[PDB]
Design a protein around this ligand. Structure first.
Ligand SMILES: Nc1ncnc2c1ncn2[C@@H]1O[C@H](CO)[C@@H](O)[C@H]1O
Ligand SMILES: [Cl-]
Ligand SMILES: [Cl-]
Length: 240
């Protein structure tokens, strides 16, 4: 069988995504979000296993889709969502490590901007420094939703690396010196794409591991932190 492909990576028909989309790296987590938090839900994509779904959260249209791991992968999916699917707001709902001595496993981090070791943003701004910056209304909606839910949060910079298995001496010490709160792999690729399209993006992540102390969240602890983060993100969509 053959379906028309609106993009090379997505079989959803134009219009099948809501204007607001949550994205997480793991397509199986996108399915869990749809199954446990969306109503009126339909699967709209499964190309390359990258499951995506559209429904409603408290009556408001909302989609959720996986983005895979790394800047190049999220860039494909987000470019398509903003361009072909006419999405207006994407919130990445992720996991991360931390080096910050005052950030702990299970903490919820709301990202204001993200550094990177990728070249993708230099390529957009004539080789210069282009800060991957979250939209202020999105950051504010996340912060205010967490406050109303009485869930503490850390607010600050992320660092999006191309290399999960770092061999780079001095990186963690510099990240700590400048109070980067989250180490992940995608957000610095998302924010400039939103800018290109005049659209909005943000990111919220839970700390799975402390890169310095080697503390690590158990499976049960990751489920609880996920439940906190996803409720914050879902409630924030109602303000966006
Ligand atoms: N310690 C970490 N370093 C890099 N990426 C991380 C880390 N913890 C979680 N992630 C996120 O999960 C995936 C890597 O396991 C990526 O999609 C990334 O954004
Ligand atoms: Cl392809
Ligand atoms: Cl999960």
């Amino acid at each position: 069988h053959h379906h028309h492909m609106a993009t090379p990576h997505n079989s959803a028909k134009v219009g099948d995504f809501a204007e607001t989309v949550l994205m997480c790296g793991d397509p199986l987590r996108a399915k869990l979000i749809a199954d446990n938090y969306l109503e009126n839900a339909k699967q709209v994509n499964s190309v390359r296993g990258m499951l995506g779904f559209t429904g409603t959260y408290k009556g408001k249209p909302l989609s959720v889709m996986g983005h895979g791991m790394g800047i190049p992968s999220i860039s494909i999916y987000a470019e398509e969502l903003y361009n072909v699917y006419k999405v207006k707001t994407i919130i990445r709902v992720g996991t991360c490590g931390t080096v910050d001595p005052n950030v702990h496993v299970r903490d919820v981090c709301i990202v204001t901007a993200s550094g990177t070791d990728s070249n993708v943003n230099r390529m957009r701004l004539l080789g210069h420094d282009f800060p991957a910056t979250a939209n202020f209304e999105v950051v504010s909606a996340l912060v205010e939703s967490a406050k109303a839910l009485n869930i503490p949060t850390q607010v600050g910079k992320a660092y999006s690396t191309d290399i999960f298995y770092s061999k780079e001496q001095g990186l963690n010490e510099a990240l700590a010196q400048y109070h980067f709160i989250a180490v992940e792999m995608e957000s610095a690729g998302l924010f400039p794409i939103a800018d290109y399209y005049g659209a909005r993006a943000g990111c919220i992540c839970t700390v799975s591991d402390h890169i310095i102390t080697h503390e690590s969240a158990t499976p049960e602890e990751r489920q609880t932190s996920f439940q906190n983060m996803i409720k914050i993100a879902l409630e924030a969509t109602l303000k966006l």
